[PDB]
Amino acid sequence: TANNPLYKEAMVALSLKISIGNVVKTMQFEPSTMVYDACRMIRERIPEALAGPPNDFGLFLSDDDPKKGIWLEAGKALDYYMLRNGDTMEYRKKQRPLKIRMLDGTVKTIMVDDSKTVTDMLMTICARIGITNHDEYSLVREDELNWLDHGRTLREQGVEEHETLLLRRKFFYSDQNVDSRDPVQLNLLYVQARDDILNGSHPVSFDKACEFAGFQCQIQFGPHNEQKHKAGFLDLKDFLPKEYVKQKGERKIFQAHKNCGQMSEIEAKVRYVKLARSLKTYGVSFFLVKEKMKGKNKLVPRLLGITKECVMRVDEKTKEVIQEWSLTNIKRWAASPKSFTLDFGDYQDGYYSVQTTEGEQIAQLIAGYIRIILKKKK
Template sequence: MAPLSLKIVLDEGAVTRTLKFESTTTVADAQAQVKEKILTGDDGKVYGLFLTSADDERSGIWLEGHRQLDYYMLRDGDQLHYLPRMRNLRVRLLDGSVRTLQVDESKTVEELMVDICARIGITNHDEYGLCHDREEPDESKLPAGTGTLTLRRVAQKKERDAKLEQLSKKIKTDDNVEWLEQKSTLRELGAGDAPLLLKRRLFYSDRNVDARDPVQLNLLYVQARDAILEGRHPVTEDQGE
């Protein structure tokens, strides 16, 4: 078969080179040729070939190493982006701690949750999700002797009382959380350097929470506490104590 001429884009478009490949060349071998013929040094990073969609350069697919190029029905002149696959992702937990984890950008959010939860120490990864972080109050600026719980209780008491009656009429409450799409990659979702918030997305049953698991118990407590104090889960004052 005739050689396939492809434009290899590096450094987010700063460099473009045209290379010829046999259509039966595997993606892994094509990456090796790019590294040999275009790159001048080895920076130690793990790279991959990314085929963008016609509508949005952030969207597309990462080519799988064991596939042949003809599997993706590439044509002469098509562009492939040669991109680092690994990136540092900052994940904030509800207890305020921030973990910096190295993740594979070729994986979907759903796949990443397996790795992220395993490193943090959470076993039931399918119950957790990622969402964009919200600005939290700066506790260093609070008056002496005033904790976050006290501040929220005072500042939101009137608003919470008004919400309770309205929320109690609903069959279920809505946290208004915009979860990251499970089937998309971080690149497709435009996730930048800002931390992402990890929190429980699904509640199957309290039986799934092991009383001997301090990580999950703490995260569950913080999430439930905040939901009550912010009026998203209506409870009586006695129940909230």
């Protein structure tokens, strides 16, 4: 037997494996060490940590489930993260490429900070794209809109780095008037109004849907030409909401297309946007819910509409308003995986409670509008 002269009793330091690419090196840190100091310590000791500026890197604790990996906050101490001796910490690049389908419909790759929430990332995306009103925009994955949670990272929501995401307007709070003076901005307004009508986010009548498609034909084909714009020419799936495809609508569309005459592309776009904005459905987010009506024991489907100013009860078929409450009449709301409920305080006897799979989405849209209203009163 032999005693070790290097035996050192009562060591408290945390001993961690720092991983930088394929390099691994063990380092010792006081548990009170702040994350920003641990980073600085790693830059001073491991030359491979100087591959870029410090704002581009961070400390990352990986997990066998990628969505459970964690970026360490610079303002916290190491022992906050419950590290034990032998744990691995990555000094890891925060920027990853993100494929974004822009508003114009095109695809582009943008560098985003993997440690930030969708809300903070959206600031960066809008800034590069030149977008004014970034509180009004969100992201969806590739129908019913699968909105991402603004308060969470992409990683923690399961978004893989290869997935292409869509930038789309979510809150309809402010609208600048439509002029032909900026054709690039006019196009953005036209593509947005058009996709919402074709997607079904913006529900319209059959008659309006064919008027819109007429303008759409003027825009994509130019003036109507009886020789070429014959019967069977149109792929109706591309010009009408899904619910109206299975009707014999082509002749109504060609009629409205004819009625444009020699109308220019720019003028067709201005009229498409203005007709969209002129509809009572414009700017309303609709959700399918099920109501308990007194007596009738089966639940009747209904549309719940949200705007910047109110919540509304709307008939599923006719799209008429049965009942409206202003956001200032709402005391509380509550979402569940099965339900959504509104407390109106003094303005109503009884709560309004509906079955729905989208309670969390409803609550997030209401809370978002309220955030914008409060911000624009600072």
